[PDB]
Design a binder for this molecule. Sequence first.
Ligand SMILES: [Zn+2]
Length: 96
Amino acid sequence: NYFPQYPEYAIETARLRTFEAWPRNLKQKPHQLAEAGFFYTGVGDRVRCFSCGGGLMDWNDNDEPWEQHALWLSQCRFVKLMKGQLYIDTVAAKPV
Ligand SMILES: [Zn+2]
């Protein structure tokens, strides 16, 4: 059924605040990861989505939150409602 997997982190602001210990040297800044529906696990570079509860880590230089989101967590209703199913389909088709 649909409702946030982490209702407490439904609001962006609440999600942002968890990145205070986020590894500064990373390309993915907190505001980015936050907007893409992610909150910080407090450990390493691991984050989880408030809606799908999916967690992504090992963030490489070439990674964009939304895209990574769409790629691995394709069934996430937050992405579909923000980016739309086309974006998802597109990201799912992209070569690299
Ligand atoms: Zn998600």
